[PDB]
């Protein structure tokens, strides 16, 4: 289906989230020509500097270069009065963070985390093959549909490793507009020195996200950013909270999940496995049923938006 | 040893000293971005010829220039009680002179020298299109980022042309004596400003490729007597394509001396140069011997315990 | 293993099967798979692999057979027939061969100066949403070379950009504006020579962008006008543009726009009309008729913008210049 680039075709119904600096509003909407429900993301461009407007245009280039089952498809993009409007299909369970903040406050089940992280690593394996570094892999950027499909969505943050036609070994750009992302960034991104970073930096953010889905709170949550930088630089690695690691302590995760989170979060980037190597890891071999059969049942306490 | 906060910035250790004051590393405590700060004691500025006017001019220019090859000003902060000013700048790893001092022949391979010269000419064409004459082009005023991008830095000596003047005519002799053209050494009343920067970029290309200077003298008078004669030599290991470019730059009469157009059109500029030798690396940190030149802020974070 | 001459002949013939598709899908799927496989086989010759770098003899044979066969014209013409990942491979092949050098020569720029239709077929691709993003990537690499930028600027087809920067699909319209800005700003002497000889036609179209009902078209077009007028290569354009009473009447309307950004960009162009020595009498008649209104307005204009010291010097200089005007 094709969506018209005119502001009259969409009935905005309710607010489902906010983003960018504090400038983006995310709305559930109805597309009048068919009655299909969609997400509309709106940013007022009069609030944006010329650097911010240029940063928003880069997301629209990258979201056209990718076509993968586990990356969010963009349906339309247009200007209405002062506002940049972006349209997507609507993910009925919200983000993986919205589930934690509403129905899984003490952390998710290990099998539900396996289905989610397999879908995230399948999207990263495509993006890393295209010659890009995703930045901001976090539980807010993972979205779940009513039929249990998992989508990665942080595309504003992406950087190309291709320069003058050559794929570079490492890159040195410090991520712009990233204050809300600093806990999930790796030590070699924050160091800003002559080493640079590469695609192994996302394998750290998958380990931080795995801890966030399992524990229900992010590592380094209450810290000022300078204390969290100090703990990253002194080498403090976060891990799963269960009866082997120490009110909610009446559980264990499998040794496979403990080993997965320790293959991520390594200090040396070259010792981290690639996204295609992690999809072979023994943690995922507990998945037996189809994702679209299992995930809606693993989420049984939740009500999907319909 | 102990943390100090200046606005949102945490003070780190010394990166060097400039023409007007100390340069230090700083951390933005909100965004964790790594920066440099130039510290200007107002007590010292009024001891230097026009120093307070040069600092004011340098700030007014840096607020309105935006290019990939020119240094970026981030903030200006004041401390009127202690009589200090701080300019917060983009971080660069070292100057081009610190690399040249780090090898025994004091030169770069032709493949590496060509890669910096193309970035210098991209930055000069921007500055000239904006009407800025940078009177002090030399390896000491060219800075390298961690990504290997070159930045033209010290705008304090520069002159800005009036918007309605039809040509780049300049009056005033300024900047480093060893990089100035015969028009300055002969003490002329008027000269083309853009053709001064082509000479200083010519002495720069001669130096970084050859490891020598075209003109020398024991003091300013002997140096300007030797520049005023206009006569110099090019060594026998210098290739014919480069030797011709170093004669179109370094030309005695400003009308015969190359423009940016004739430099970009030259055979040595448009050729592709093979990596026939290993490039000169950015040298390790001078005190700690750290090869990556990592942040000095960690013992200051361990004093502050966050914030 | 297959040669470049085999791979060029394979891709030529499989494209010639896709060109018609009179036979049923059982042949079209095979032809589509052949086009995909041979585009990867070409890209492996140009970009190599991590254990086996590009070999200069294979690149020389491939680049010559792509001139001999006419296949560069065919892949650009028939780009709609190729699948999603294959269309990105055509852009990655094309840009690498366009950067080829033989000493000081660029032999692919020497090639495209005959069969110039490659440049116009890439420019036409903005009218086709399923290929516009790849055509835009290939076209921006062409205009890095001054002969190819010159063919586009000096053509009747250039004036299509005034439609492409106003399209309702914003990810295409903003890619068309990026290509439009690069043609006007990259080659300084070529752009100045064009803007003199085509002044009366170019500024008669450009005033329609300053009247646009799209906010982002209006905002980006007024930003670029200030950057074209302040550039010292354009001094003869600038002094002619500021000599026209219609151009001042527009800038005094844009100072009253509802957007703070449009007002602030208009001030930086309006400044240049009043700061001018040797004004023509139509400009003096306009400013003398508006003298009190301008002094009262400039005394109130964005006084909350207190962080900028040179903005306050320019406002002070303009209020003085408007007080110092002499009656006829
Ligand atoms: N298509 C969608 N379907 C459902 N929820 C969405 C969708 N897009 C965004 N959201 C919700 O909006 C929030 C903010 O969007 P996000 O893309 O994360 O903004 P930002 O990156 O600017 O911070 C998400 O974390 C999620 O709660």
Numbering used by the authors:
A (entry chain B): 60 to 305, 342 to 401
B (entry chain C): 41 to 347
C (entry chain A): 9 to 336
What does the paper say about this structure?
In this study, we evaluated the Gatan Alpine detector, designed for operation at 100 and 200 keV. In addition to collections with a standard apoferritin sample, we also tested the performance of the Gatan Alpine detector on the LKB1-STRADα-MO25α complex (referred to hereafter as the LKB1 complex), which is considerably smaller (115 kDa) and asymmetric. Additionally, we obtained 3.2 Å resolution reconstruction of a 115 kDa asymmetric LKB1-STRADα-MO25α protein complex collected using Gatan Alpine on a TFS Glacios at 120 keV, demonstrating the applicability of this detector to more challenging biological samples.
Notably, the LKB1 sample was resolved to a higher resolution at 120 keV than at 200 keV (~ 3.2 Å vs. ~ 3.4 Å, respectively), with the local resolution ranges and Q-score metrics following similar trends as the FSC resolutions. To compare Gatan Alpine’s performance to the best imaging setup available to us, we also imaged the LKB1 complex with a TFS Titan Krios G2 at 300 keV with a BioQuantum energy filter and a K3 camera. Again, we started with a comparable initial number of particles for image processing and reached a similar final particle stack size. This yielded a reconstruction at 2.86 Å which was the highest resolution reconstruction out of all LKB1 complex datasets. Overall, the global conformation is similar to the crystal structure even though no nucleotide was added during sample preparation and we observed an apo LKB1 and an ADP-bound STRADα. Additionally, we were able to build some previously unresolved flexible loops and also observed some missing regions of the heterotrimeric complex in comparison to the crystal structure. Specifically, no density was observed for the STRADα Trp-Glu-Phe motif within the MO25α hydrophobic pocket although it was present in the construct and has been previously observed in both of the crystal structures. This motif is known to be required for MO25α recognition and binding in the absence of LKB1. Another region not resolved in our structure as compared to the crystal structure was the C-terminus of STRADα (residues 401–414). This may be due to the fact that it packs against the next molecule in the asymmetric unit in the crystal, packing not available in single-particle cryo-EM. Additionally, we resolved a more complete LKB1 C-terminal flanking tail (residues 311–347) at the LKB1-STRADα interface, resulting in novel interactions with STRADα.
